[PDB]
């Protein structure tokens, strides 16, 4: 196998070319890639939040040397290229991107591989680090997440935002709490903390926001002291200001976000993102959409009436 037979095999587009050429280079890594196989990949997937249809194709499809020639070759390259710059802020590392899922269900969930290919080395990483266990769990259900969205969304396994998951196994974000935090640089090359906010844990009551938010500052200090982040970032639905239009006086995004402060810039399109996370939306009619909570009706109701919702980006100088 090389590049270009690489390609051919798992059907991959021209624009994966770039890409491959990196991986070629790279070649194998030092530390042979181990896949846990039967019971020992179930108790793995289980702790990392799998939901139980897919564990078991995971389980079944987990790829070989000789069995899977092609995607073995992409696997290692890929997994190479992370722990290349393990932890490393300054560099930028796109893993691959999502693969053609015809060639089987090893390639639809390629990144899961990658990630259980690397959780070693992430695992490494965070203890010279004195990352607690605790934290490194936590962080690491992520992965159960990735693959439950992508059943939600399409019906059919995979992982959605790899660049997410490839960003988290290189050691670059922290679930503290109820809240992530990737350690990131602006523009200016200035530090910067990037804030998101998770699916999985339930409504952001303000008890649970505040715990999370104090923890951050002094957390990055204690573990990663060259960083030095003193604000937050973060661009989304929730800061658009028309959902006070919608949304009850009690809301938890009403009351929550004043602590942000919004940049004035260019309009940002905001339908694709608001009925991605609100309803992991795939395609189908509106009126097909559930309309139990006050924010589906808000959502539904605005762009039924012709009108459009924005993204916002904003900051915080951190407690
Ligand atoms: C808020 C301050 C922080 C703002 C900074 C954000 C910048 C950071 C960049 C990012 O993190 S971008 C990614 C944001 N992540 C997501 O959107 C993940 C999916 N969203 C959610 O899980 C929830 O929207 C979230 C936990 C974040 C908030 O839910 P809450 O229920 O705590 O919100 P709230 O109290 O304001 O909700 C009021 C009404 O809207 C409803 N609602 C809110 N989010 C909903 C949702 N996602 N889907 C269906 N309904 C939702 C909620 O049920 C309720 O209706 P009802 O009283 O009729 O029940
Ligand atoms: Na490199």
Do not use: C
């Not at 390609?7 to 770039?18: F, I, K, V």
């Not at 962080?139 to 969304?153: D, F, M, N, P, Y």
């Not at 809240?179 to 523009?187: D, E, H, I, T």
């Not at 976000?257 to 009619?285: C, H, K, M």
Request: no cysteine.
């Amino acid at each position: 196998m090389d590049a270009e037979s690489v390609r051919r095999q798992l059907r991959l587009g021209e624009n994966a070319t770039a890409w491959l050429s990196r991986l070629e280079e790279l070649g194998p890594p030092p530390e042979p890639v181990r896949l846990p196989q039967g019971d020992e990949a179930r108790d793995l997937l289980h702790r990392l939040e799998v939901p139980a249809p897919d564990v078991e194709e995971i389980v079944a499809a987990t790829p070989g040397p000789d069995r899977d020639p092609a995607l073995w070759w992409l696997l290692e390259r890929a997994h190479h290229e992370l722990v290349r710059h393990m932890g490393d802020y300054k560099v930028k590392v796109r893993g691959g991107p999502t693969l053609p899922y015809e060639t089987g269900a090893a390639a639809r969930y390629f990144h899961v591989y990658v990630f259980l290919a690397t959780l070693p080395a992430l695992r490494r990483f965070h203890a010279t680090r004195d990352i607690p266990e605790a934290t490194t769990w936590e962080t690491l259900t992520q992965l159960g997440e990735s693959v439950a969205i992508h059943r939600r969304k399409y019906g059919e396994g995979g992982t959605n935002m790899p660049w997410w998951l490839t960003l988290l196994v290189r050691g670059l974000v922290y679930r503290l709490g109820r809240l992530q935090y990737n350690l990131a640089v602006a523009k200016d090359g200035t530090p910067v903390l990037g804030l998101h906010i998770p699916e999985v844990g339930g409504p952001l009551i303000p008890d649970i926001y505040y715990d999370s938010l104090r923890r951050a500052r002094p957390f990055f200090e204690r573990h990663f002291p060259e960083h030095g982040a003193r604000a937050a970032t973060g661009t989304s639905w929730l800061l658009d200001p028309q959902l006070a239009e919608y949304l009850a006086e009690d809301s938890h995004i009403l009351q929550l976000r004043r602590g942000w402060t919004l940049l004035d810039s260019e309009p940002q399109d905001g339908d694709d993102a608001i009925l991605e996370f609100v309803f992991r939306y795939n395609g189908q009619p509106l009126e097909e959409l559930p309309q139990r909570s006050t924010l589906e009706k808000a959502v539904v109701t605005h762009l039924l009436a012709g009108r459009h919702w924005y993204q916002r980006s904003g900051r915080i100088e951190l407690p």
